[PDB]
Symmetry: C3
Subunit: 117 residues, 3 copies
């Protein structure tokens, strides 16, 4: 999985080691081995979420197979909201997630694509 988190929290208000805890949480939630989970955090950005520049965060989650239905994503969303609200000290109205299915021919890994591994 590929997780990307943009926030207007400054880096010094994003708890140390968030990327590592998010990586482990994602592995558990999405049912994927932790050595296949990728996390990118981009703090200190200028953001409006739902029209408001109060602290907020946007999460993007991309994966093969497991983020392509409403019913799967409803479950995933609940868990990721729980994780981020606590970590970032945000209410649920200050987080949004976007889910993006991927296919193996899209993933370049060790100089080839996942199709051939």
């Amino acid at each position: 999985p590929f997780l990307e988190l943009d926030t207007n929290l400054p880096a010094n208000r994003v708890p140390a080691g968030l990327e590592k805890r998010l990586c482990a949480a994602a592995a558990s939630i999405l049912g994927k081995p932790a050595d296949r989970v990728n996390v990118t955090v981009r703090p200190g950005l200028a953001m409006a979420l739902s029209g408001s520049t109060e602290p907020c965060a946007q999460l993007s989650i991309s994966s093969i197979g497991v983020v392509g239905t409403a019913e799967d994503n409803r479950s995933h969303s609940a868990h990721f909201f729980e994780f981020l609200t606590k970590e970032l000290a945000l209410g649920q109205d200050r987080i949004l997630i976007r889910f993006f299915p991927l296919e193996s021919w899209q993933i370049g890994k060790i100089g080839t694509v996942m199709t051939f591994l």
Copy 2:
């Protein structure tokens, strides 16, 4: 809508409050309520646009329903170019936009997905 703006302008050359003005402009252009508009600005990046590292900006716009045709996007592009050229003091050859349709099952909101709200 979800707008993401990457620029090689340093943060101190991106006018204060851009994210708020872009949020209001997007609401007007895309015909969506301002409390559904999201904007993320990432300044100070290293960028080449059309082969050149002169100041520039890349905008991504994602939304349900309204960014999926050439004729819709032609109109949207004109307006967003007008907005950004003035705000960022850029010529039109230094901005590019990418439009991405989204579906409700992709949007995690308040711990569920938009499908169920």
Copy 3:
């Protein structure tokens, strides 16, 4: 083409002028004129790749026509891995790429969309 590179290398460990060399490399690899190539580098991020927070980089490549098959992307991946491993002093296990086909109606250019140019 639109290339986006996220890294946890600090900006002062990303060689000067990387964005320019990546732009020229991409033009050669993807067979596109260099004045149509776009590169964005976002350094100093907090990242885990394959579960690990050691230095790493994620590259996204978006283009019309040339990134939509496994066999095309296998070739592209080899070249981009070669480029980035050397530039960033990373092993191949510390880089991942994602390929995203685009269509002309998605690209806002000079106030219109590529469809009409």
